Design an enzyme around this catalytic site. Sequence first.
Site, PDB file in Angstrom:
ATOM      1  N   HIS A   1      40.121  40.113  39.926  1.00 46.43           N
ATOM      2  CA  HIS A   1      41.450  40.778  39.794  1.00 46.43           C
ATOM      3  C   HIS A   1      41.558  42.044  40.680  1.00 46.43           C
ATOM      4  O   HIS A   1      42.657  42.643  40.725  1.00 46.43           O
ATOM      5  CB  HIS A   1      41.792  40.988  38.314  1.00 46.43           C
ATOM      6  CG  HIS A   1      41.097  42.118  37.623  1.00 46.43           C
ATOM      7  ND1 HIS A   1      40.568  41.986  36.354  1.00 46.43           N
ATOM      8  CD2 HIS A   1      40.878  43.401  37.985  1.00 46.43           C
ATOM      9  CE1 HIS A   1      40.048  43.138  35.977  1.00 46.43           C
ATOM     10  NE2 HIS A   1      40.217  44.015  36.958  1.00 46.43           N
TER      11      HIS A   1
ATOM     12  N   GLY B   1      39.883  51.898  36.466  1.00 48.49           N
ATOM     13  CA  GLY B   1      38.802  52.145  37.439  1.00 48.49           C
ATOM     14  C   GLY B   1      37.438  51.774  36.879  1.00 48.49           C
ATOM     15  O   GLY B   1      36.449  51.853  37.651  1.00 48.49           O
TER      16      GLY B   1
ATOM     17  N   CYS C   1      36.699  48.767  35.334  1.00 47.39           N
ATOM     18  CA  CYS C   1      36.446  47.337  35.640  1.00 47.39           C
ATOM     19  C   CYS C   1      35.311  47.223  36.660  1.00 47.39           C
ATOM     20  O   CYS C   1      35.257  48.037  37.606  1.00 47.39           O
ATOM     21  CB  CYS C   1      37.705  46.634  36.109  1.00 47.39           C
ATOM     22  SG  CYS C   1      38.825  46.341  34.717  1.00 47.39           S
TER      23      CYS C   1
HETATM   24  C1  LIG Z   1      39.797  47.874  34.626  1.00 43.54           C
HETATM   25  C2  LIG Z   1      40.171  48.373  35.998  1.00 43.54           C
HETATM   26  O1  LIG Z   1      39.492  49.249  36.521  1.00 43.54           O
HETATM   27  N1  LIG Z   1      41.251  47.832  36.613  1.00 43.54           N
HETATM   28  C3  LIG Z   1      41.632  48.259  37.964  1.00 43.54           C
HETATM   29  C4  LIG Z   1      42.996  48.903  37.923  1.00 43.54           C
HETATM   30  C5  LIG Z   1      44.022  47.923  37.379  1.00 43.54           C
HETATM   31  C6  LIG Z   1      45.406  48.535  37.370  1.00 43.54           C
HETATM   32  O2  LIG Z   1      45.582  49.614  36.811  1.00 43.54           O
HETATM   33  N2  LIG Z   1      46.457  47.910  37.999  1.00 43.54           N
HETATM   34  C7  LIG Z   1      47.727  48.599  38.270  1.00 43.54           C
HETATM   35  C8  LIG Z   1      48.154  48.457  39.721  1.00 43.54           C
HETATM   36  C9  LIG Z   1      48.157  47.008  40.176  1.00 43.54           C
HETATM   37  C10 LIG Z   1      46.804  46.385  39.895  1.00 43.54           C
HETATM   38  C11 LIG Z   1      46.481  46.504  38.423  1.00 43.54           C
HETATM   39  C12 LIG Z   1      43.584  47.435  35.993  1.00 43.54           C
HETATM   40  C13 LIG Z   1      42.188  46.848  36.053  1.00 43.54           C
END
Ligand SMILES: *CC(=O)N1CCC(C(=O)N2CCCCC2)CC1
EC number: 3.4.19.12
Lengths: 304, 304
Positions: A41, A143, A145
């Site tokens: 993702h 951040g 993830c």
């Molecule tokens: C869990 C993590 O760190 N993630 C990365 C950021 C993500 C997020 O905030 N978005 C918003 C902007 C478009 C991508 C997803 C969530 C997962």
Amino acid sequence: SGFRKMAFPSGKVEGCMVQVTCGTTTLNGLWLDDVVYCPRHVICTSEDMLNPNYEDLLIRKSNHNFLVQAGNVQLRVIGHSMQNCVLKLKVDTANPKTPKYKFVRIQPGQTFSVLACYNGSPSGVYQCAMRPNFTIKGSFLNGSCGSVGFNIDYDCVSFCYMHHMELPTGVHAGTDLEGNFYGPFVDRQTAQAAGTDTTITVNVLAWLYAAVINGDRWFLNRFTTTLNDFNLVAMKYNYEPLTQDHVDILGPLSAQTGIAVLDMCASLKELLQNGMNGRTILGSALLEDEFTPFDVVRQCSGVT
Amino acid sequence: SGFRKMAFPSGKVEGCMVQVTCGTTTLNGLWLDDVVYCPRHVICTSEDMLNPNYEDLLIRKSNHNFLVQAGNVQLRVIGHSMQNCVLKLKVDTANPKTPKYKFVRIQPGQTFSVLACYNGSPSGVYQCAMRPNFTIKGSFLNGSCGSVGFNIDYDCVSFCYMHHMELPTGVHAGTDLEGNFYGPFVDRQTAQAAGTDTTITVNVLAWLYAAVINGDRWFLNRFTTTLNDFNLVAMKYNYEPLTQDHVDILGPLSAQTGIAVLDMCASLKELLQNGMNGRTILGSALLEDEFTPFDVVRQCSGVT
Ligand SMILES: *CC(=O)N1CCC(C(=O)N2CCCCC2)CC1
Ligand SMILES: *CC(=O)N1CCC(C(=O)N2CCCCC2)CC1
């Protein structure tokens, strides 16, 4: 003496944390040998979100779109493939700090340490269990993830978990390092409800053993029970059914303390039926279920 | 989301742990630059124990009696001095893994991570507080003496604690890295009873803030209170008196959540007077007091 919720020393895993940036998304990767592992993702955007077609999204990505940074040094990406819900970025340099490691898929009730990271920088370490509903009760902001869960067997790190998803109920979902989700969960912003969060009965018993071993004994009673009788009480209280395998697993702790497993079950039964009456066990007011029998033996013996 | 009892990443401190053997006693030392720090009771024997005269005991010790081992490599001891209750062994080699570090004497209520070690090998990491009675509720078996407590500010480790003593009540006592005991405690096998273990009121409030920030809000009520009124309730329940300094320290969390500190005090007052009624707050059945306001801000923001 003293019993504490204890994570593994994080050193070996700190040396494996990098930052992965795809477009405007930054999260964490694991660098082992010449491969960096991260949640797929990372490639997602504002819209894809609800129903991203990862294969299709990935076509628009080249090696050079995956920016991999180990402290202040960039890693050159020379290949990228999708394995289930993780990406494997081939870098031109092997991580010099790669420990001995395995990828293991843990079972529900198994415990592990999580190194919480942001931008490939470790923030903290805590101890988790894979819940019977295949969630974990973590601490994970944006951040975080790509933060991993692990066990150490002396010098060999067994990676079991990568962080991917927060459920609307603020519990957590993720994958083993082959990118397969624990439980029915998907890397997709959708109606995902956790099932019943059942108590890990064998872990509560292990922890009841740890308590006795450290002087907290008030909950010992004169009663015994059977597996079948105890399991009727477990059912009513959303506890995992206790199996002979679990009894067998508690043998060592039985041995050391000279308390039969079924007597300790009868102690747990009374605690379930009667509560703590405002008392505590190892400084907890509820029945802790994120210590394995192995965890108790480890901490009570002093394995490094 | 999710809030978890979180230790600092141990890496920087793992690289500082050595084994110290004097005679038949083995425990842990901290290796920083060309000095190894360990509890002076490493030199103690079967008898001295009850009333060791450390200056006199030390006369019978030379540099070569202090065996210092970093993994599988021995360090050459070129000097030894006693500073309060610690020994400082000068080695001929500076620890190449010495991080940026400070020695800080923490106050009661301040939290820190402990790397539990045995034979200079890290076993685990957990989070502690210096209790108002200058004990810590640790996990420490034989060989765990010389295990240190620390805070990290980005790349600078502030060492606050070395483990020395288990009290007959199975709580723990030790020194800062200048070898001064926290509290009235001595490295001597004698009648040492801990005083009242009071709750760190400011920490409970910080944790009440962390809860709201992560969706656990049932304990918010319609009431407010004053410092003087709240402190009457604190007294009765062996809570630290709350000062304007503490209110000031909770400002940021007040700000972010838009809950006045004194309203949250009124929430804590009702929790004290009424208990949890079998409910939980961040998966705890009692009022957690080993998160500082700083700890809450850190974990809720995501500092590395
Ligand atoms: C869990 C993590 O760190 N993630 C990365 C950021 C993500 C997020 O905030 N978005 C918003 C902007 C478009 C991508 C997803 C969530 C997962
Ligand atoms: C806390 C720790 O690691 N210690 C070292 C061992 C020591 C001990 O067990 N003894 C028994 C033998 C004579 C010296 C003291 C306790 C402190």
